[PDB]
């Protein structure tokens, strides 16, 4: 039955708009297959279209906003794009139709409406670009009856091992098509849908913009050669209309020009299924998907007071939809330094200069290929897998569709190498790389990232203990299936646990350090004078200078999160030998958090170094780091240390702003200094951890029940309202929030862990 659910999940999830790096495009969960993308831009001049054309996601003055109004990857959804530069409001509706043996069928409606500022007679170029990778696959444009292009539908017939036989149709659509009275119309026609069918080597098919522009340029060169000149030039929109040449190839460019509003459909029909998909099917299944999205949202994200209002529900639907709508399928080689240079051990003072010298040997090489199916922080800025971000992303997604979340977890752990390393940043293939400066592509097998994916696994375990509808929960509804998933993943979780303990070890034994355990102590590898990128809190202040005797309380707390998860999963699988070890490690971390990291003077947890005189020193910088044992759920609800942490959390002069918890205390010497990334702003991912732990204490007997209830109530309200007010004013989820003004700052379209807000509103943890 595990095998049966696996195949049905495969078939359900195969097709999607799984190219979140571009406004709109489709690909299946197959490395070398059929991909589509949408391009559009106004044309007012002989030179403007190169500057107006849209393809890859951006955010700037020219784009008001964009995102998914509703989305669920098994069914499809609706995207809204508000383009000021091109004066267009665009809708892309995408729907999946199950059937046959090859992942089913799908359809898209593209609709563009001029805004009130646009010229009513605006000419808009729209391109549908289709590519297919594979040695033994075929794709052919059926030629038109008409001389110069198509009056009706463009039909593509293709075949592959992976998709079987299929037909991809771009409909005639509705809208005025401009007609040229120019002499050129005798050879190029007066204006119509055109198709160019081309072949390039498989590895460059993703470069749609340059491929398109090379064809436009060859057309303009043809005009120059054949005496079309500035004495009497064709109109711009005819100069940029490709000569019709349909045929077979691994690239097909479908170009339409519209005057005023337009719409057209894309119908992908799987031959292995029944009747071919129609525009009538598309309209019906779009209406059905909305109805089903609506009913699941009310069940899963039942917003509690005081966020019951319709405004909050629309806000919640927008944040959730953009998070799950960012799901991508990536395929290609990663760039990895596999030298394991001894400088990467960082055992000496000044280790950052040694490691810089090693990096400057440039022994990094492409390896793979790998695939990844994952949500992303940001379409315009970070359209790729980040390891600790994905733990936050999957908390709401698992509520929606636990089988989807387990698919993404499996996809991530299938990247783990023999030693137990997953790269914190997955840049798979040339397309993924095109967005990342070379200096920043190379992954390092000594760089960790917080194991936040274990949190998702903890939610799954608690749910396990206590057709698209049925599939979404198969892995909890059928315990045999749930357990088999954990049996197969369990060794990889354990391998990662051992990797952390082996590669991120701190030094107790070699200094004057007293503690309950000689073993449990941790130091993030990879830190520079001003940074610790691997912790996730890039520029949160750490001991100066960095030093091989450093110990990091967040890293120890993360290892606690992992042991506790392995106790749970180990127990379920009857791995008795394993569970007794985990139990002794947990006990050791509990004691060593106090013996190495607790400051009585300051009343919080601290990172540690060793002095100029080789002695253990605490270095206290009050902020997220100070609370880590509490954020990760390691403290007993009666702990005196908890009470001191609750006082710190609640203190307005330290962490507590009207807009949420500050990353760093106003009292710290490093408040608002340097890049001020994690040195004052409010981050929703760490606020979400605080909110969940306060709620845990508020719904249990103990000395802090009422303190925790008050802080829970207020922090939930402060966080939700800051994210909502900013969404209402800007249309955006932001990366972080200003604790003086409450303004969203840094990166827009951060959905992204800012979307946890939908879990905070729905409550009941
Ligand atoms: C002056 S700056 O404000 O542009 C600035 C200051 C400092 Br210092 C460092 C950086 N790095 C750039 C950078 C690269 C890749 C992803 C991110 C986004 N975040 C950063 C999160 O910290 C990380 O936890 C999270 O996984 C990651 C993904 O969501 C950012 C930028
Ligand atoms: C889905 O089935 C195909 C069959 O060719 C298989 O090779 C592929 O790995 C499966 N997809 C996954 C594991 O998501």
| CA–CA dist 153, 92 (Å, integer) | 19
Closest ligand to the CA of 533: 1
Residue in the block written with tokens 């951006």: 58
Its sign, for the CA torsion 381, 384, 389, 390, is positive
Residue 695 placed within a domain: no
| CA–CA dist 469, 473 (Å, integer) | 7
Residue 408, SS3?
Answer: helix
| CA–CA dist 624, 643 (Å, integer) | 16
Q: Helix crossing, 640-650 with 705-730: angle to 10°?
A: 30
- Give the determination technique: X-ray
Which residue among the candidates 468, 538, 587, 595 is catalytic per the annotation?
538
Where do the H-state alpha helices sit in 301-386? Answer: 310-325, 351-359
> For residue 487, what are the CA distances in angstroms to 237, 363, 480?
60, 37, 11
Residue in the block written with tokens 């998909």: 277
> For residue 404, what are the CA distances in angstroms to 13, 324, 465?
8, 10, 19
Helices (H) and strands (E) in the chain, counts: 21, 26
Q: What is the DSSP letter of 744?
A: E
| CA–CA dist 765, 716 (Å, integer) | 13
Residue 633 placed within a domain: no
First to last CA, the chain: 31
- In the chain, which residues are last before a break of more than 2.5 Å from C to the next N? 466
The residue ranges of DSSP E strands in 578-634, in sequence order, are 598-599, 604-605, 607-610, 616-619
CB neighbour class for 653 (10 Å; exposed up to 12, middle 13-18, buried from 19): exposed
| CA–CA dist 96, 107 (Å, integer) | 7
Interval between CA 31 and ligand 2 midpoint (Å): 11
- Last residue of one domain, picked from the residues 298, 318, 336: 298
| CA–CA dist 386, 534 (Å, integer) | 11
Its sign, for the CA torsion 397, 403, 408, 409, is positive
> For residue 131, what are the CA distances in angstroms to 96, 150, 161, 168?
20, 20, 16, 12
The verdict on the CB of residue 677 being under 6 Å from ligand 1 is yes
What would the two tokens of residue 29 be?
């969960």
CB neighbour class for 60 (10 Å; exposed up to 12, middle 13-18, buried from 19): exposed
Determine which residue's CA is closest to atom 5 belonging to ligand 2. 162
Query: Does residue 752 have a cis bond before it (omega within 30 degrees)?
Result: yes
> For residue 410, what are the CA distances in angstroms to 49, 188, 348, 462, 476?
43, 52, 38, 19, 16
Residue pair 756/685 in contact (Cβ under 8 Å)? The answer is yes
Interval between CA 737 and ligand 1 midpoint (Å): 15
Determine which residue's CA is closest to atom 14 belonging to ligand 2. 10
Closest ligand to the CA of 746: 1
CB neighbour class for 221 (10 Å; exposed up to 12, middle 13-18, buried from 19): exposed
Report the atom number in ligand 1 closest to the C-alpha of 388: 26
The verdict on the CB of residue 746 being under 6 Å from ligand 1 is yes
The verdict on the CB of residue 377 being under 6 Å from ligand 1 is yes
Cα–Cα–Cα angle for 747, 749, 750, rounded to 5 degrees: 70
Residue pair 630/639 in contact (Cβ under 8 Å)? The answer is no
Contacts 24+ apart (CB under 8 A), 146-151: 146/189, 146/192, 147/189, 148/188, 148/189, 148/190, 148/192, 148/194, 148/244, 149/189, 149/192, 149/193, 149/194, 149/195, 149/244, 150/192, 150/193, 150/194, 150/195, 150/244, 151/192, 151/193
For residue 254, what are the β-bridge partners? 128, 195
Residue pair 723/684 in contact (Cβ under 8 Å)? The answer is yes
Determine which residue's CA is closest to atom 17 belonging to ligand 1. 382
Residue 170 placed within a domain: yes
Closest ligand to the CA of 753: 1
| CA–CA dist 345, 327 (Å, integer) | 35
Where do the H-state alpha helices sit in 371-444? Answer: 387-400, 402-413, 430-433
Residue 352 placed within a domain: no
| CA–CA dist 416, 426 (Å, integer) | 12
Its sign, for the CA torsion 211, 213, 218, 222, is positive
> For residue 552, what are the CA distances in angstroms to 405, 421, 559, 646?
30, 20, 11, 21
Q: Phi/psi at 254 (nearest 5 deg)?
A: -105, 115
* Nearest to 33, CA basis, from 155, 163, 156: 163
- Last residue of one domain, picked from the residues 229, 263, 298: 298
Q: How many domains does the chain have?
A: 2
Residue pair 63/55 in contact (Cβ under 8 Å)? The answer is no
| CA–CA dist 364, 420 (Å, integer) | 19
HEC states along 468-529? Answer: HHHHHHHHHHCHHHHHHHHHHHHHHHHHHHHHHHHHCECCCCCCECCCCCCCCCECCCCCEC
Cα–Cα–Cα angle for 238, 239, 242, rounded to 5 degrees: 80
Where do the H-state alpha helices sit in 226-278? Answer: 236-239
* Nearest to 476, CA basis, from 463, 462, 485, 486: 463
Where do the H-state alpha helices sit in 626-732? Answer: 628-631, 640-650, 684-698, 705-730
Where do the H-state alpha helices sit in 307-401? Answer: 310-325, 351-359, 387-400
Residue 585 placed within a domain: yes
Strands 174-176 and 164-170: unpaired
Determine which residue's CA is closest to atom 4 belonging to ligand 2. 162
Interval between CA 10 and ligand 2 midpoint (Å): 7
Interval between CA 95 and ligand 2 midpoint (Å): 22
The verdict on the CB of residue 538 being under 6 Å from ligand 1 is yes
Determine which residue's CA is closest to atom 12 belonging to ligand 2. 10
| CA–CA dist 523, 257 (Å, integer) | 59
The overall longest dimension of the chain from CA atoms, in Å, is 91
Interval between CA 288 and ligand 2 midpoint (Å): 28
What would the two tokens of residue 436 be?
């990342």
Residue 84: which residues within 8 A CB-CB, separation 6 or more?
61, 62, 63, 64, 115, 117
Residue pair 702/719 in contact (Cβ under 8 Å)? The answer is no
Residue 64: which residues within 8 A CB-CB, separation 6 or more?
82, 83, 84, 731
Active site (annotated) includes residue 538: yes
Residue 678 placed within a domain: no
Residues at CB less than 6 angstroms from ligand 2? 10, 29
Residue pair 193/254 in contact (Cβ under 8 Å)? The answer is yes
| CA–CA dist 480, 475 (Å, integer) | 8
What would the two tokens of residue 513 be?
């350090």
Residue 139: which residues within 8 A CB-CB, separation 6 or more?
34, 130, 132, 156, 157, 158, 159, 248, 249, 250, 252
Report the C-alpha dihedral over residues 406, 412, 414, 420, rounded to 10 degrees: -120
- Last residue of one domain, picked from the residues 298, 326, 361: 298
Residue 435: which residues within 8 A CB-CB, separation 6 or more?
21, 56, 383, 384
Interval between CA 284 and ligand 2 midpoint (Å): 30
Q: What is the DSSP letter of 384?
A: S
CA of residue 432 relative to chain centroid, distance: 13
Exposure on the CB side of residue 577, measured as CA atoms within 13 A:
1
Where do the H-state alpha helices sit in 598-663? Answer: 628-631, 640-650
Active site (annotated) includes residue 221: no
Interval between CA 459 and ligand 2 midpoint (Å): 26
CATH code of the domain in which 214 resides = 2.70.98.110
Determine which residue's CA is closest to atom 16 belonging to ligand 1. 382
Residue pair 265/107 in contact (Cβ under 8 Å)? The answer is yes
What would the two tokens of residue 473 be?
């929960």
Residue 258 placed within a domain: yes
* Nearest to 59, CA basis, from 371, 525, 283, 380: 380
Report the atom number in ligand 1 closest to the C-alpha of 389: 26
| CA–CA dist 555, 420 (Å, integer) | 17
The verdict on the CB of residue 675 being under 6 Å from ligand 1 is yes
Q: Which domain holds residue 228?
A: 21-298
| CA–CA dist 502, 522 (Å, integer) | 10
Residue 593 placed within a domain: yes
Residue pair 396/758 in contact (Cβ under 8 Å)? The answer is yes
Determine which residue's CA is closest to atom 9 belonging to ligand 1. 538
| CA–CA dist 120, 135 (Å, integer) | 47
């Amino acid at each position: 039955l595990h095998s049966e659910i696996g195949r049905l999940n495969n078939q359900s999830l195969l097709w999607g708009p799984y190219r979140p790096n571009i406004y709109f495009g489709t690909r299946p969960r197959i490395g070398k297959s059929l991909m589509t993308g949408l391009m559009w831009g106004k044309i007012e001049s002989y030179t403007d279209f190169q500057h107006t054309v849209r393809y890859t996601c951006e955010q700037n003055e020219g784009m008001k906003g964009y995102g998914w109004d509703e989305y669920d990857p098994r069914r499809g959804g609706i995207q809204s794009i508000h383009d000021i530069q091109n004066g267009l409001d665009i809708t892309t509706s995408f729907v999946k139709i199950p059937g046959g043996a090859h992942g089913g069928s799908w359809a898209a409606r593209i609709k563009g409406t001029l805004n009130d500022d646009a010229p009513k007679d605006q000419k808009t170029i729209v391109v549908f670009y289709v590519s297919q990778e594979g040695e033994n696959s075929e794709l052919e444009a059926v030629p038109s009856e008409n001389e110069f292009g198509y009056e009706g539908d463009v039909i593509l017939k293709g075949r592959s091992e992976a998709l079987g036989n299929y037909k991809l149709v771009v409909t005639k659509g509705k809208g005025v098509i401009p007609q040229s009275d120019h002499d050129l119309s005798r050879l190029r026609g007066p204006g119509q849908t055109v198709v160019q069918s081309l072949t390039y080597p498989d590895e460059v098919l993703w470069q749609a913009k340059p491929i398109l522009f090379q064809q436009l340029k060859a057309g303009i060169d043809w005009l120059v050669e054949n005496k079309y000149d500035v004495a009497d030039p064709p109109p711009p929109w005819q100069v940029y209309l490709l000569a019709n040449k349909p045929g077979s190839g691994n690239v097909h460019i479908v170009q339409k020009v519209f005057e005023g509003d337009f719409e057209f459909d894309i119908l992908f029909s799987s031959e292995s299924a029944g009747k071919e998909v129609t525009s009538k099917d598309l309209e019906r299944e779009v209406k059905q998907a909305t109805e089903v999205f609506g009913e699941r949202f009310a069940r899963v994200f039942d917003l509690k007071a005081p966020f019951q209002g319709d405004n909050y529900k629309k806000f919640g639907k927008s944040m959730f939809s953009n998070l799950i709508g960012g799901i991508g399928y990536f395929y290609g080689h990663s760039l990895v330094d596999r030298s394991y240079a001894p400088e990467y051990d960082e055992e000496n003072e000044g280790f950052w200069e040694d490691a810089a010298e090693a990096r400057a040997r440039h022994q990094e090489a492409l390896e793979g290929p790998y695939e990844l199916f994952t949500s992303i922080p940001s379409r315009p800025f970070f359209p790729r897998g980040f390891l600790w971000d994905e733990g936050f992303h999957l908390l709401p997604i698992a509520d929606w569709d636990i089988d989807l979340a387990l698919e993404i977890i499996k996809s991530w752990y299938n990247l783990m190498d023999e030693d137990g390393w997953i790269a914190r940043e997955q840049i798979l293939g040339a397309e993924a790389r095109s967005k990342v400066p070379k200096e920043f592509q190379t992954q390092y097998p000594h760089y960790a990232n917080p194991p936040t994916l274990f949190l998702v696994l903890d939610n799954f375990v608690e749910r396990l203990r206590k057709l698209d509808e049925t599939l979404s929960t198969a892995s909890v509804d059928n315990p045999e299936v749930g357990l088999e998933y954990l049996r197969r993943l369990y060794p990889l979780l354990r391998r990662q646990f051992d990797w952390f303990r082996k590669t991120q070890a701190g030094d107790i034994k070699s200094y004057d350090r007293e503690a309950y355990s000689t073993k449990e102590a941790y130091r993030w590898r990879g830190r520079t004078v001003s940074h610790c990128l691997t912790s996730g809190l890039d520029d949160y202040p750490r001991p100066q200078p960095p030093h091989p005797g450093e110990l990091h309380v967040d890293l120890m707390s993360w290892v606690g999160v992992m042991v506790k998860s392995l106790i749970s999963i180990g127990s379920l699988l009857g791995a008795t030998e394993d569970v007794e070890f985990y139990t002794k490690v947990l006990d050791a971390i509990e004691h060593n958090l106090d013996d190495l990291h607790w400051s009585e003077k300051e009343g919080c947890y601290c990172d540690a170094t060793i002095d100029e005189f080789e002695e253990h020193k605490l270095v206290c910088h009050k902020g997220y780091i100070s609370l880590f044992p509490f954020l990760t759920g390691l403290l007993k609800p009666d702990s005196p240390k908890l009470g001191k942490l609750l006082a710190l959390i609640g203190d307005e002069s330290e962490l507590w702003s009207p807009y949420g918890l500050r990353s760093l205390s106003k009292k710290d010497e490093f408040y608002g200094t340097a890049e001020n990334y994690w040195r004052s702003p409010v981050w929703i991912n760490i606020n979400y951890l605080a909110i969940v732990q306060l709620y845990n204490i508020a719904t249990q007997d103990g000395p802090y029940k009422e303190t925790a209830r008050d802080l829970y109530t207020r922090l939930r309200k402060n966080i939700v309202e800051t994210v909502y007010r900013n969404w209402e004013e800007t249309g955006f989820a932001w990366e972080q929030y200003n604790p003086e003004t409450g303004k969203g700052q840094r990166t827009q379209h951060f959905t992204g862990w800012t979307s946890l807000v939908v879990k905070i509103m729905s409550g009941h943890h």
